[PDB]
């Protein structure tokens, strides 16, 4: 029952896995803090509310085709070098919320330093709390890092705030759970992961969500560690979450950022967070996308098809510093849906 001090005193601060403020980039907002246990259970399913509103991320692809809900839990699935951390930075930059909580689990110390430098550059400095653990820490503290980030998010949610929590990565948190379980007598069950791991991923992953007070919307990064190897964890985490964003290294090599493969992504809350007009426009654009990709890798029909493909790829491509209001995103959605209605038809 390890506890830690959380609250307004950690705003604009960097916390080590035990809640010690090791750095600030903002004068302390206020000296208000509770003691809280960092590993508690999710709230009762019957105390939840529905994922109603959308969360406007300012990213066109997400807000248009994969709209997130306030209280949703979303995964960011990618192999190496596809831009998970950069997508996190863009989401922090362009999303509107009261508090942003980031949990860096088991990265190099220099990566922690680079993230904190980016955090210092931003205009939302006073709204952010970073909790970190490097690979040099024991696995216990790597688990405590994510648990503590979740606890900070929960504090500010109980204050009635819209919180956005990030965990980079859930792959490393799962491996740290595995190592702590193994190094205490527990036996492996599936791909060397002890059984308790599978009971302890949702325990953490089901803590975010909306309540009668405020809300926590959560993004978790998952590594697609190699083909045809061990990925029981990627699939299990996919199971636990309310959707996922897949980043293809195909698009990443082109420089098409964010490297979101829309056809491989889904927001399982899209139906209840979007208007019916938006929903049918999004279905039209998804039909158009899949119809175009059916051709891609194979006269004037093909001219129109591929120039439309270029237009769509350009509309999806968007730099980190660039922000798109929901209105602008929706009008672009309407235009491409129009392009599905009046279509060239090469078959
Ligand atoms: N959206 C983006 N915009 C611009 N460059 C990007 C973007 N995403 C990735 N990059 C490039 O990729 C580099 C690092 O990408 P990352 O965001 O770290 O991907 P990653 O999957 O998080 O890597 P890991 O954590 O080591 S597996 C950046 O320094 C850029 O050169
Ligand atoms: Mg990363
Ligand atoms: Mg695995």
CSV table of C-alpha atoms and ligand atoms in Angstrom, one decimal:
chain,number,residue,atom,x,y,z
A,1,UNK,CA,0.0,0.0,0.0
A,2,UNK,CA,2.6,2.5,-1.1
A,3,UNK,CA,1.1,6.0,-1.0
A,4,UNK,CA,2.3,9.4,-2.3
A,5,UNK,CA,1.5,13.1,-2.1
A,6,UNK,CA,-0.5,14.3,-5.1
A,7,UNK,CA,-2.4,17.4,-5.8
A,8,UNK,CA,-2.0,21.0,-7.0
A,9,UNK,CA,1.6,21.0,-5.7
A,10,UNK,CA,2.8,18.6,-8.5
A,11,UNK,CA,1.4,20.8,-11.3
A,12,UNK,CA,4.2,21.9,-13.6
A,13,UNK,CA,6.5,19.4,-11.9
A,14,UNK,CA,8.4,16.2,-12.7
A,15,UNK,CA,7.9,13.3,-10.2
A,16,UNK,CA,10.0,10.3,-9.7
A,17,UNK,CA,8.2,7.0,-9.2
A,18,UNK,CA,7.6,7.8,-5.5
A,19,UNK,CA,6.2,11.3,-5.8
A,20,UNK,CA,9.3,13.3,-5.0
A,21,UNK,CA,9.3,16.5,-7.0
A,22,UNK,CA,12.7,16.3,-8.7
A,23,UNK,CA,12.2,19.3,-11.0
A,24,UNK,CA,9.8,22.1,-11.8
A,25,UNK,CA,9.2,24.2,-15.0
A,26,UNK,CA,6.5,26.3,-13.4
A,27,UNK,CA,6.3,28.1,-10.0
A,28,UNK,CA,4.2,25.9,-7.7
A,29,UNK,CA,0.6,26.6,-8.6
A,30,UNK,CA,-0.7,26.0,-5.0
A,31,UNK,CA,0.5,24.0,-1.9
A,32,UNK,CA,-2.5,21.7,-1.8
A,33,UNK,CA,-1.9,17.9,-1.7
A,34,UNK,CA,-3.5,14.7,-0.4
A,35,UNK,CA,-1.9,11.5,0.5
A,36,UNK,CA,-3.2,8.8,-1.8
A,37,UNK,CA,-2.6,5.1,-2.4
A,38,UNK,CA,-1.2,4.7,-5.9
A,39,UNK,CA,-2.4,1.1,-6.5
A,40,UNK,CA,-6.2,1.1,-5.9
A,41,UNK,CA,-9.0,-0.6,-7.7
A,42,UNK,CA,-11.1,0.9,-10.5
A,43,UNK,CA,-14.4,2.5,-9.5
A,44,UNK,CA,-17.5,0.4,-9.7
A,45,UNK,CA,-19.0,0.0,-13.1
A,46,UNK,CA,-22.3,1.3,-11.6
A,47,UNK,CA,-20.7,4.6,-10.5
A,48,UNK,CA,-19.6,5.4,-14.1
A,49,UNK,CA,-21.3,7.7,-16.6
A,50,UNK,CA,-21.5,7.2,-20.3
A,51,UNK,CA,-18.8,8.4,-22.7
A,52,UNK,CA,-20.9,11.3,-24.0
A,53,UNK,CA,-19.0,14.3,-25.3
A,54,UNK,CA,-16.2,14.1,-27.8
A,55,UNK,CA,-12.7,15.1,-26.9
A,56,UNK,CA,-11.4,17.5,-29.5
A,57,UNK,CA,-7.8,16.7,-30.1
A,58,UNK,CA,-7.2,19.3,-32.8
A,59,UNK,CA,-5.9,16.5,-35.1
A,60,UNK,CA,-7.9,16.2,-38.3
A,61,UNK,CA,-7.6,12.4,-38.8
A,62,UNK,CA,-8.6,11.6,-35.2
A,63,UNK,CA,-11.4,14.2,-34.8
A,64,UNK,CA,-12.8,13.3,-38.2
A,65,UNK,CA,-12.6,9.5,-38.6
A,66,UNK,CA,-11.7,8.2,-35.1
A,67,UNK,CA,-13.4,10.7,-32.7
A,68,UNK,CA,-12.4,10.2,-29.1
A,69,UNK,CA,-14.8,10.5,-26.2
A,70,UNK,CA,-14.3,12.3,-22.9
A,71,UNK,CA,-13.5,9.4,-20.5
A,72,UNK,CA,-12.4,7.0,-23.3
A,73,UNK,CA,-9.3,4.8,-23.1
A,74,UNK,CA,-7.4,4.8,-26.4
A,75,UNK,CA,-4.3,2.9,-27.4
A,76,UNK,CA,-1.5,4.1,-29.7
A,77,UNK,CA,-0.2,1.0,-31.4
A,78,UNK,CA,3.0,1.2,-33.4
A,79,UNK,CA,6.3,-0.6,-33.9
A,80,UNK,CA,9.5,1.4,-33.4
A,81,UNK,CA,10.1,4.7,-35.1
A,82,UNK,CA,6.5,5.3,-36.1
A,83,UNK,CA,5.9,8.4,-34.0
A,84,UNK,CA,4.1,7.4,-30.8
A,85,UNK,CA,5.9,10.0,-28.6
A,86,UNK,CA,5.5,12.7,-31.2
A,87,UNK,CA,1.8,11.9,-31.5
A,88,UNK,CA,1.7,12.3,-27.7
A,89,UNK,CA,3.3,15.7,-28.0
A,90,UNK,CA,0.9,16.8,-30.7
A,91,UNK,CA,-2.1,15.6,-28.6
A,92,UNK,CA,-0.8,17.5,-25.6
A,93,UNK,CA,-0.3,20.6,-27.8
A,94,UNK,CA,-3.6,20.7,-29.5
A,95,UNK,CA,-6.1,19.1,-27.1
A,96,UNK,CA,-8.1,21.2,-24.7
A,97,UNK,CA,-8.3,20.0,-21.1
A,98,UNK,CA,-7.5,21.3,-17.5
A,99,UNK,CA,-4.7,18.9,-16.6
A,100,UNK,CA,-2.3,16.7,-18.6
A,101,UNK,CA,-0.6,13.8,-16.9
A,102,UNK,CA,2.2,11.9,-18.6
A,103,UNK,CA,3.8,8.7,-17.4
A,104,UNK,CA,7.1,7.7,-19.0
A,105,UNK,CA,7.8,4.0,-18.0
A,106,UNK,CA,11.2,2.5,-18.6
A,107,UNK,CA,12.8,4.8,-21.3
A,108,UNK,CA,16.3,6.1,-21.4
A,109,UNK,CA,17.1,9.0,-19.1
A,110,UNK,CA,17.9,11.2,-22.1
A,111,UNK,CA,14.4,10.5,-23.5
A,112,UNK,CA,13.0,11.7,-20.2
A,113,UNK,CA,15.2,14.8,-20.5
A,114,UNK,CA,14.0,15.5,-24.1
A,115,UNK,CA,10.4,15.2,-23.1
A,116,UNK,CA,10.8,17.6,-20.2
A,117,UNK,CA,12.6,20.1,-22.5
A,118,UNK,CA,9.6,19.9,-24.9
A,119,UNK,CA,7.3,20.4,-21.9
A,120,UNK,CA,9.3,23.5,-20.9
A,121,UNK,CA,8.8,24.9,-24.4
A,122,UNK,CA,5.0,24.5,-24.4
A,123,UNK,CA,2.3,27.1,-23.6
A,124,UNK,CA,0.5,24.6,-21.3
A,125,UNK,CA,3.4,24.2,-18.9
A,126,UNK,CA,1.4,24.9,-15.8
A,127,UNK,CA,-1.2,22.3,-16.8
A,128,UNK,CA,1.2,19.3,-17.0
A,129,UNK,CA,2.6,16.7,-14.6
A,130,UNK,CA,5.3,14.3,-15.7
A,131,UNK,CA,6.0,11.1,-13.8
A,132,UNK,CA,9.0,9.1,-15.0
A,133,UNK,CA,11.0,5.9,-14.5
A,134,UNK,CA,14.1,5.0,-16.5
A,135,UNK,CA,15.3,1.5,-17.3
A,136,UNK,CA,17.9,1.8,-14.5
A,137,UNK,CA,15.0,1.7,-12.0
A,138,UNK,CA,13.7,-1.5,-10.5
A,139,UNK,CA,10.6,-2.9,-12.1
A,140,UNK,CA,8.7,-2.2,-8.9
A,141,UNK,CA,9.3,1.6,-9.4
A,142,UNK,CA,8.4,1.3,-13.1
A,143,UNK,CA,5.0,0.0,-12.1
A,144,UNK,CA,4.7,2.6,-9.4
A,145,UNK,CA,5.3,5.3,-12.0
A,146,UNK,CA,2.2,4.5,-14.0
A,147,UNK,CA,0.2,3.9,-10.9
A,148,UNK,CA,1.2,7.3,-9.6
A,149,UNK,CA,0.4,9.1,-12.9
A,150,UNK,CA,-3.0,7.5,-12.7
A,151,UNK,CA,-3.3,8.6,-9.1
A,152,UNK,CA,-2.5,12.2,-10.0
A,153,UNK,CA,-5.1,12.1,-12.8
A,154,UNK,CA,-7.6,10.7,-10.3
A,155,UNK,CA,-7.0,13.5,-7.9
A,156,UNK,CA,-7.6,16.2,-10.4
A,157,UNK,CA,-10.7,14.3,-11.7
A,158,UNK,CA,-12.0,14.4,-8.2
A,159,UNK,CA,-11.4,18.1,-8.2
A,160,UNK,CA,-13.8,18.2,-11.1
A,161,UNK,CA,-11.3,18.6,-14.0
A,162,UNK,CA,-11.0,17.3,-17.5
A,163,UNK,CA,-7.8,15.3,-17.3
A,164,UNK,CA,-5.9,13.6,-20.1
A,165,UNK,CA,-3.5,10.8,-19.0
A,166,UNK,CA,-0.7,9.4,-21.1
A,167,UNK,CA,1.2,6.1,-20.5
A,168,UNK,CA,4.4,5.5,-22.5
A,169,UNK,CA,4.4,2.6,-22.6
A,170,UNK,CA,2.0,-0.1,-21.6
A,171,UNK,CA,4.3,-2.7,-23.1
A,172,UNK,CA,6.9,-1.7,-20.5
A,173,UNK,CA,4.4,-1.6,-17.7
A,174,UNK,CA,3.3,-5.1,-18.6
A,175,UNK,CA,6.9,-6.3,-18.7
A,176,UNK,CA,7.5,-4.7,-15.2
A,177,UNK,CA,4.4,-6.4,-13.8
A,178,UNK,CA,5.8,-9.6,-15.3
A,179,UNK,CA,9.2,-9.2,-13.7
A,180,UNK,CA,7.8,-8.2,-10.3
A,181,UNK,CA,5.5,-11.3,-10.4
A,182,UNK,CA,8.3,-13.7,-11.5
A,183,UNK,CA,10.7,-12.4,-8.9
A,184,UNK,CA,8.3,-13.3,-6.1
A,185,UNK,CA,7.4,-17.0,-6.8
A,186,UNK,CA,4.6,-16.6,-9.3
A,187,UNK,CA,4.7,-19.0,-12.2
A,188,UNK,CA,4.6,-18.1,-15.9
A,189,UNK,CA,1.3,-18.9,-17.7
A,190,UNK,CA,1.3,-17.4,-21.2
A,191,UNK,CA,4.5,-16.5,-23.0
A,192,UNK,CA,6.2,-16.3,-19.7
A,193,UNK,CA,3.8,-13.8,-18.3
A,194,UNK,CA,2.4,-14.9,-14.9
A,195,UNK,CA,-1.4,-15.0,-14.6
A,196,UNK,CA,-1.6,-12.0,-12.3
A,197,UNK,CA,-0.4,-9.8,-15.1
A,198,UNK,CA,-3.6,-10.4,-17.0
A,199,UNK,CA,-5.6,-9.5,-13.8
A,200,UNK,CA,-3.4,-6.4,-13.2
A,201,UNK,CA,-3.4,-4.7,-16.6
A,202,UNK,CA,-7.2,-3.9,-16.5
A,203,UNK,CA,-6.9,-2.9,-12.8
A,204,UNK,CA,-4.8,0.0,-14.0
A,205,UNK,CA,-6.4,0.4,-17.4
A,206,UNK,CA,-10.0,0.6,-16.0
A,207,UNK,CA,-9.3,3.5,-13.6
A,208,UNK,CA,-9.7,6.3,-16.2
A,209,UNK,CA,-13.2,7.2,-17.3
A,210,UNK,CA,-15.9,9.9,-16.8
A,211,UNK,CA,-17.7,10.3,-13.5
A,212,UNK,CA,-20.3,12.6,-11.9
A,213,UNK,CA,-17.5,15.0,-11.1
A,214,UNK,CA,-14.8,15.3,-13.8
A,215,UNK,CA,-13.2,12.8,-16.2
A,216,UNK,CA,-10.0,11.1,-17.2
A,217,UNK,CA,-9.4,10.4,-20.9
A,218,UNK,CA,-6.4,8.0,-21.3
A,219,UNK,CA,-4.0,7.3,-24.1
A,220,UNK,CA,-1.7,4.2,-23.8
A,221,UNK,CA,1.2,3.5,-26.2
A,222,UNK,CA,1.7,-0.2,-27.1
A,223,UNK,CA,4.8,-1.5,-28.9
A,224,UNK,CA,4.3,-3.9,-31.8
A,225,UNK,CA,7.5,-5.6,-31.0
A,226,UNK,CA,8.4,-7.5,-34.2
A,227,UNK,CA,6.4,-9.8,-36.4
A,228,UNK,CA,5.6,-13.4,-35.5
A,229,UNK,CA,7.2,-13.1,-32.0
A,230,UNK,CA,5.6,-12.6,-28.6
A,231,UNK,CA,2.8,-10.3,-28.7
A,232,UNK,CA,0.1,-11.7,-26.2
A,233,UNK,CA,0.3,-8.3,-24.5
A,234,UNK,CA,-0.4,-6.2,-27.6
A,235,UNK,CA,-3.6,-8.2,-28.3
A,236,UNK,CA,-4.7,-8.3,-24.6
A,237,UNK,CA,-4.3,-4.6,-24.3
A,238,UNK,CA,-6.2,-4.1,-27.5
A,239,UNK,CA,-8.9,-6.2,-25.8
A,240,UNK,CA,-9.0,-4.0,-22.7
A,241,UNK,CA,-9.2,-0.7,-24.5
A,242,UNK,CA,-12.0,1.3,-26.1
A,243,UNK,CA,-10.2,1.6,-29.4
A,244,UNK,CA,-6.8,2.0,-30.9
A,245,UNK,CA,-4.7,4.1,-33.3
A,246,UNK,CA,-2.3,2.0,-35.5
A,247,UNK,CA,0.7,3.8,-36.8
A,248,UNK,CA,2.2,2.1,-39.9
A,249,UNK,CA,5.9,2.5,-40.5
A,250,UNK,CA,5.0,2.5,-44.2
A,251,UNK,CA,3.5,6.0,-43.8
A,252,UNK,CA,6.3,6.9,-41.3
A,253,UNK,CA,9.0,6.2,-43.9
A,254,UNK,CA,7.2,8.6,-46.3
A,255,UNK,CA,7.2,11.3,-43.7
A,256,UNK,CA,3.4,11.2,-43.6
A,257,UNK,CA,2.8,12.3,-40.0
A,258,UNK,CA,0.8,11.5,-37.9
A,259,UNK,CA,1.5,8.0,-39.3
A,260,UNK,CA,-2.1,7.0,-38.6
A,261,UNK,CA,-3.4,4.1,-40.7
A,262,UNK,CA,-7.1,5.0,-40.5
A,263,UNK,CA,-8.3,1.7,-42.0
A,264,UNK,CA,-6.5,-0.1,-39.1
A,265,UNK,CA,-7.7,2.2,-36.4
A,266,UNK,CA,-11.1,2.5,-34.6
A,267,UNK,CA,-12.7,4.6,-31.8
A,268,UNK,CA,-15.2,2.2,-30.3
A,269,UNK,CA,-17.1,5.2,-28.9
A,270,UNK,CA,-17.5,7.0,-32.3
A,271,UNK,CA,-21.2,6.3,-32.5
A,272,UNK,CA,-22.2,8.0,-29.3
A,273,UNK,CA,-19.8,11.0,-29.5
A,274,UNK,CA,-20.7,12.1,-33.1
A,275,UNK,CA,-23.8,13.6,-34.7
A,276,UNK,CA,-25.5,11.3,-37.3
A,277,UNK,CA,-24.4,13.6,-40.1
A,278,UNK,CA,-20.8,13.4,-39.0
A,279,UNK,CA,-21.2,9.6,-38.7
A,280,UNK,CA,-22.5,9.1,-42.2
A,281,UNK,CA,-19.9,11.5,-43.6
A,282,UNK,CA,-17.2,9.4,-41.8
A,283,UNK,CA,-18.6,6.2,-43.2
A,284,UNK,CA,-18.6,7.7,-46.7
A,285,UNK,CA,-14.9,8.8,-46.3
A,286,UNK,CA,-14.0,5.3,-45.0
A,287,UNK,CA,-15.7,3.7,-48.0
A,288,UNK,CA,-13.8,6.1,-50.2
A,289,UNK,CA,-10.5,5.3,-48.5
A,290,UNK,CA,-10.9,1.6,-48.8
A,291,UNK,CA,-12.0,1.9,-52.4
A,292,UNK,CA,-8.9,3.9,-53.2
A,293,UNK,CA,-6.5,1.5,-51.4
A,294,UNK,CA,-8.0,-1.4,-53.3
A,295,UNK,CA,-6.5,0.2,-56.4
A,296,UNK,CA,-3.3,1.9,-55.1
A,297,UNK,CA,-0.6,-0.7,-55.4
A,298,UNK,CA,-1.7,-2.0,-58.9
A,299,UNK,CA,-6.1,6.2,-68.0
A,300,UNK,CA,-8.4,9.0,-66.8
A,301,UNK,CA,-10.4,6.9,-64.2
A,302,UNK,CA,-7.1,6.1,-62.6
A,303,UNK,CA,-6.0,9.7,-62.9
A,304,UNK,CA,-9.0,10.9,-60.9
A,305,UNK,CA,-8.6,8.0,-58.4
A,306,UNK,CA,-5.0,8.7,-57.6
A,307,UNK,CA,-5.3,12.5,-57.5
A,308,UNK,CA,-8.2,12.0,-55.0
A,309,UNK,CA,-5.9,9.7,-53.1
A,310,UNK,CA,-3.2,12.4,-53.0
A,311,UNK,CA,-5.8,15.0,-51.8
A,312,UNK,CA,-6.9,12.7,-49.0
A,313,UNK,CA,-3.3,11.8,-47.9
A,314,UNK,CA,-2.6,15.5,-47.9
A,315,UNK,CA,-5.6,16.3,-45.8
A,316,UNK,CA,-4.7,13.6,-43.3
A,317,UNK,CA,-1.0,14.7,-43.1
A,318,UNK,CA,-0.7,17.4,-40.4
A,319,UNK,CA,2.3,18.8,-38.5
A,320,UNK,CA,2.6,18.8,-34.7
A,321,UNK,CA,2.4,22.6,-34.4
A,322,UNK,CA,-0.7,22.7,-36.6
A,323,UNK,CA,-4.2,22.9,-35.0
A,324,UNK,CA,-7.6,22.2,-36.7
A,325,UNK,CA,-10.8,23.3,-35.1
A,326,UNK,CA,-13.7,20.7,-35.1
A,327,UNK,CA,-15.6,22.9,-37.6
A,328,UNK,CA,-12.7,22.9,-40.2
A,329,UNK,CA,-12.1,19.2,-39.7
A,330,UNK,CA,-15.8,18.5,-40.3
A,331,UNK,CA,-16.0,20.6,-43.4
A,332,UNK,CA,-13.0,18.7,-44.8
A,333,UNK,CA,-14.9,15.5,-43.9
A,334,UNK,CA,-17.9,16.8,-45.8
A,335,UNK,CA,-15.9,17.6,-48.9
A,336,UNK,CA,-14.3,14.1,-49.1
A,337,UNK,CA,-17.7,12.5,-48.4
A,338,UNK,CA,-18.9,14.5,-51.4
A,339,UNK,CA,-16.1,12.9,-53.3
A,340,UNK,CA,-17.5,9.6,-52.4
A,341,UNK,CA,-21.0,10.5,-53.6
A,342,UNK,CA,-20.0,11.9,-57.0
A,343,UNK,CA,-17.3,9.3,-57.7
A,344,UNK,CA,-15.5,8.5,-60.9
A,345,UNK,CA,-16.2,4.7,-60.7
A,346,UNK,CA,-13.5,2.6,-62.4
A,347,UNK,CA,-15.5,-0.6,-61.8
B,1,LIG,N1,4.5,13.2,-36.1
B,1,LIG,C1,5.8,13.3,-36.4
B,1,LIG,N2,6.3,14.4,-37.0
B,1,LIG,C2,7.6,14.6,-37.3
B,1,LIG,N3,8.6,13.7,-37.1
B,1,LIG,C3,8.1,12.6,-36.5
B,1,LIG,C4,6.8,12.3,-36.2
B,1,LIG,N4,6.7,11.0,-35.6
B,1,LIG,C5,7.9,10.6,-35.7
B,1,LIG,N5,8.8,11.4,-36.2
B,1,LIG,C6,10.2,11.2,-36.4
B,1,LIG,O1,10.6,10.1,-35.6
B,1,LIG,C7,11.5,10.5,-34.5
B,1,LIG,C8,11.0,9.8,-33.2
B,1,LIG,O2,9.7,9.2,-33.3
B,1,LIG,P1,9.0,8.6,-32.0
B,1,LIG,O3,7.9,9.6,-31.7
B,1,LIG,O4,10.0,8.4,-30.9
B,1,LIG,O5,8.4,7.2,-32.4
B,1,LIG,P2,8.3,6.1,-31.3
B,1,LIG,O6,7.5,4.9,-31.8
B,1,LIG,O7,7.7,6.7,-30.0
B,1,LIG,O8,9.8,5.6,-30.9
B,1,LIG,P3,10.1,4.7,-29.7
B,1,LIG,O9,9.5,5.2,-28.4
B,1,LIG,O10,11.7,4.6,-29.5
B,1,LIG,S1,9.5,2.8,-30.1
B,1,LIG,C9,11.4,12.0,-34.5
B,1,LIG,O11,12.6,12.6,-34.0
B,1,LIG,C10,11.1,12.3,-35.9
B,1,LIG,O12,12.4,12.4,-36.7
B,2,LIG,MG1,7.8,6.2,-27.3
B,3,LIG,MG1,4.7,-9.8,-25.1
